[PDB]
């Protein structure tokens, strides 16, 4: 591994298991060699260069007196070393040396030697003097990259939790997670990997090809094999197994991906995992760019982001916002709801734009379209904040969302407050969809408004508590919320504990009935059987559910016409058509 001939259009150096060359040659693609290993890792354009494989690996500069010679591995010819006295190209940022050698287009990327020793710079970029003859600047990366990663050790110590935080570069899935799993298998650990969504879990399987990875489905309450494998499952799958199985594996290493997920199941999962760590029975790793103890809406990125603040349409527009459609790249747009999404998406197609819409229940079947199809826009709810990757150049983020809130004033009900501003963490994740890939145009994060920090009225913290104290363990131990997220609720521990058949109904209401946690709890803690659906009709006048401006009526399981009017009103069962369709299927006694 010394030097090569990029095909010739350019030349590279093969040091450090990384490949050093320039952006203007071969753009930003792959070089085909045996056993592969070729893909963009870092790029710069002021200093024309695309070091890939690793960050960088070229040390020392040429000073100001040392003579520097250039290799001449040119197309059709042999390598011809040529000694020169380096000149000086004075710029605004600083004067860098510039050698004057006569070479033909295609030899760009040849190494220059530090008088005696290794490479001191990269030849193949300069300007022509109309009066003079030839010139090329001594362009060199300064300073170096990271370059690669190796795993720390108390990461695997029992009774230690490790929050591994960094921006959407960054390799937490493609290079870091497999490095951890591989090190885990060497130490023969019962390892659990948790993903937020099934599609993200799919991205882990491909990233973990060659490793004993077994994806675990929620249709199974537990699965044990004498063979030593690694369990891969969704956060919610982990929680439901904790609620439905006694045979709970005592994993000694648990790795949660996207540990910022505020879904009631994810929070509860963090609550349980944290507790197992306190028992000195497991090691935990929480991977997320925005841990609960952070509020930076504009985190770092591995490519320059143009943060633009301007007015953004909340609904259908007709004139004014020419910048939205005049943009000729791919755009990801975050909307607070599916209703808002449709209103936005419909106006976009009128302008002749290919639009794909995304939501929680349509994520698995629409997200693959964002890869196969050529598209102009992607309208999404806050679901894309968790591991959703796009090949876009711009994000339009109104920073608005819907927030489930449990109203205590009077009869308890769950409303979907909003559109209210998102959390500082959420804004960072929406932004982090871009600035991942080095492009000639820096990515644009177009946003509006400021994020709000306080989300202690969010129903999910209470819902996560309801899930937690219904998880039984080798006691006397009560599972509580994960440290930072503990102050989000004033609920006393164990106050949501149910017993036997009530606890059983509670789980089935969620799993078989597809009901929200709060709604499932109210019914189950009321003593109502699962198959009994009479509470769906014995509600107050104001608890009448509407569907496209008309009062919903349901044909019961016996063949009777009743108005959909639940005793407890959770706004999330009739928020969108797909949610309402499912709940009507439940109230009918069809599932």
């Amino acid at each position: 591994e010394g030097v090569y001939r990029i095909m010739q259009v350019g030349v590279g150096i093969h040091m450090e298991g990384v490949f050093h060359t320039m952006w203007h040659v071969t753009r930003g693609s792959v070089i085909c060699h045996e056993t592969g290993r070729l893909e963009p890792s870092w790029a710069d354009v002021r200093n024309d260069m695309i070091s890939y494989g690793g960050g960088w690996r070229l040390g020392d500069k040429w000073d100001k007196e040392e003579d520097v010679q250039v290799l001449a591995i040119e197309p059709g010819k042999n390598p011809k070393h040529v000694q020169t006295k380096p000149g000086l190209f004075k710029t605004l940022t600083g004067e860098i040396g510039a050698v004057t050698l006569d070479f033909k287009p295609g030899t760009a990327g040849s190494p220059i030697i530090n008088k005696k020793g290794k490479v001191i710079g990269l030849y193949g970029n300069g300007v022509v003097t109309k009066s003079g003859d030839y010139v090329s600047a001594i362009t060199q990366a300064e300073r170096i990259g990271e370059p690669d990663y190796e795993v720390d050790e108390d990461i695997f110590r029992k009774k230690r939790l490790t929050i591994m935080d960094l921006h959407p570069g960054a390799g937490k899935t493609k290079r870091i997670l497999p490095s951890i799993v591989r090190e885990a298998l060497k130490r023969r650990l019962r390892t659990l990997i948790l993903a937020p969504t099934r599609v993200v879990a799919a991205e882990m399987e491909e990233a973990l090809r060659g490793l004993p990875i077994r994806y675990q489905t929620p249709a199974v309450k537990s699965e044990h094999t004498g063979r030593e494998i690694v369990d891969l499952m969704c956060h919610a799958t982990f929680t439901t197994r904790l609620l439905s199985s006694t045979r709970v594996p005592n994993y000694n290493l648990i790795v949660m991906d996207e540990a910022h997920f505020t879904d009631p199941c994810s929070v509860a999962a963090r609550g349980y995992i944290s507790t197992r760590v306190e028992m000195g029975e497991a090691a935990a790793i929480f991977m997320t760019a925005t841990p609960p103890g952070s509020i930076d809406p504009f985190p770092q990125s591995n490519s320059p982001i143009e943060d633009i603040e301007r007015e953004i349409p909340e609904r259908s527009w007709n004139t004014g916002f020419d910048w939205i459609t005049d943009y000729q790249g791919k755009t990801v747009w975050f909307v607070p709801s599916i209703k808002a999404g449709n209103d936005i998406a419909n106006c976009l197609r009128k302008s002749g734009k290919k639009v794909i819409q995304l939501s929680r229940k349509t994520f698995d079947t629409e997200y693959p379209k964002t890869k196969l199809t050529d598209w102009d826009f992607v309208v999404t709810t806050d679901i894309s904040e968790m591991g959703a990757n796009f090949r876009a150049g711009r994000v339009i983020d109104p920073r608005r969302c819907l927030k489930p809130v449990i109203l205590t004033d009077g009869p308890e009900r769950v409303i979907l407050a909003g559109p209210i501003p998102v959390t500082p963490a959420s804004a960072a994740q929406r932004r982090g969809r871009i600035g991942r890939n080095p492009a000639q145009e820096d990515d644009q994060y177009v946003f509006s408004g400021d994020p709000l920090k306080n989300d202690e009225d969010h129903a999910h913290w209470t819902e996560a508590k309801m899930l937690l104290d219904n998880i039984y363990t080798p006691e006397g131990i009560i599972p509580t919320l994960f440290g930072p997220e503990r102050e989000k609720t004033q609920a006393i521990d164990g106050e949501f504990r149910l017993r036997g058949e009530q606890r059983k109904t509670f789980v089935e209401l969620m799993r078989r009935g597809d009901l929200p946690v709060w709604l499932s709890y109210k019914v189950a803690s009321a003593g109502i059987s699962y198959k009994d659906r009479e509470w769906c009709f014995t509600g107050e006048r104001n608890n009448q559910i509407l569907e496209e401006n008309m009062e919903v009526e349901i044909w019961t399981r016996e063949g009777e016409k009743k108005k959909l009017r639940p005793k407890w009103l959770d706004a999330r069962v009739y928020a969108d058509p797909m949610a309402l369709k499912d709940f009507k299927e439940f109230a009918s006694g069809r599932k």
């Binding site: 090569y4 150096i13 070393h81 020169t84 000149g87 000086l88 510039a98 003079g132 000639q440």
Partner: peptide, 30 residues
């Protein structure tokens, strides 16, 4: 083709001071 200095290399090149206009998109100018 390794990082090996060659003493038998040819010596060339003038060394003038060059005021350069550098930019993002491309390389260098005047």
């Amino acid at each position: 083709a390794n990082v090996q200095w060659d003493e038998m290399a040819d010596i060339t090149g003038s060394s003038p001071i060059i005021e350069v206009k550098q930019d993002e998109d491309g390389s260098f100018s005047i």
